[PDB]
Amino acid sequence: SRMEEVD
Amino acid sequence: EGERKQIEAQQNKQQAISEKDRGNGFFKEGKYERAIECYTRGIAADGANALLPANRAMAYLKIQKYEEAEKDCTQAILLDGSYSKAFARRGTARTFLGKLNEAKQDFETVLLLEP
């Protein structure tokens, strides 16, 4: 879910 | 002369970053199929930014690809082996592909980077 976050 | 115009041809590669931001904008609102477009166009002009194949791999995950996500993640790690997100996403893709050992070591790689 933090890995799901896109930078 | 041509070399300076070449460094200028470089620095103009912020197109990649804007295509990145836009594709991210598409991703955040659930429109992955255009996110991938912006990501691809972003890659075509540089090239050596891990964020593009990483994010495109994530979109690929969101549309059930895994193979494409794995290849893009591998590329992203090749560009930057300090980005834990690429490892996590590749671990997910491999987990779905049945590559459990490799997915596992990608996961504990994530644990190793962050923590």
Numbering used by the authors:
A (entry chain C): 1 to 7
B (entry chain A): 267 to 381
Please quote the authors directly.
The R2TP complex is found in organisms from yeast to humans, and consists of the AAA+ ATPases Rvb1 and Rvb2 (human: RUVBL1 and RUVBL2), a TPR-containing protein, Tah1 (human: Spagh or RPAP3), and Pih1 (also known as NOP17 and Pih1D1, but referred to as Pih1 henceforth; Kakihara and Houry, 2012; Te et al., 2007). Pih1 is the multipoint scaffold of the R2TP complex, coupling the Rvb1-Rvb2 hetero-dodecamer, the Hsp90 chaperone machinery (via Tah1 in yeast or Spagh/RPAP3 in metazoa), and the TTT (Tel2-Tti1-Tti2) complex implicated in activation and stabilization of PIKKs (Hurov et al., 2010; Kakihara and Houry, 2012). The biological roles ascribed to the R2TP complex are directly associated with its ability to interact with the Hsp90 chaperone system and function as an Hsp90 cochaperone (Boulon et al., 2010; Izumi et al., 2012; Takai et al., 2010). Here we present crystal structures of Hsp90-Tah1-Pih1, Hsp90-Spagh/RPAP3, and Pih1-Tel2 complexes that together define key structural links within the R2TP core in yeast and in animals and reveal how R2TP connects the Hsp90 chaperone system to the TTT complex involved in PIKK activation.
We next determined the crystal structures of each of the TPR domains (TPR1 and 2) of human Spagh/RPAP3 cocrystallized with the Hsp90 C-terminal peptide. Spagh-TPR2267–381 consists of six α helices, with the first five again aligning with Tah1-TPR. The N-terminal helix of Spagh-TPR2 is double the length of the N-terminal helices of Tah1 or Spagh-TPR1 and projects out of the core TPR domain. In both Spagh/RPAP3 TPR domains, the Hsp90 C-terminal peptide is bound in the groove formed by the first five α helices. The peptide bound to TPR2 adopts a compacted conformation very similar to the Tah1 complex, making extensive interactions with the walls of the groove. The Hsp90 peptide bound to TPR1 makes fewer interactions and is less well structured, but in both cases the α-carboxyl and the side chain of the C-terminal aspartic acid are bound by a “carboxylate clamp” (Scheufler et al., 2000), anchored by the side chains of Asn 172 (TPR1) and Asn 321 (TPR2), each of which make a bidentate interaction with the peptide NH and α-carboxyl of the C-terminal aspartic acid residue of the Hsp90 peptide. The TPR1 and TPR2 domains of Spagh/RPAP3 have a typical TPR domain structure, but lack the distinct hydrophobic pocket formed between helices 5 and 7, into which the methionine side chain of the MEEVD motif binds (Morgan et al., 2012; Zhang et al., 2005). Instead and similar to Tah1, the methionine side chain packs against the surface of helix 5 and remains partially exposed. Mutation of TPR1 (N172E) or TPR2 (N321E) and fitting with a two site model suggested that binding for one site (nonmutant site) remained unaffected (N172E-TPR1 mutant, TPR2: KD = 9.7 μM and N321E-TPR2 mutant, TPR1: KD = 0.94 μM), whereas the mutated TPR sites were compromised for binding (N172E-TPR1 mutant, TPR1: KD = ∼231 μM and N321E-TPR2 mutant, TPR2: KD = ∼109 μM).
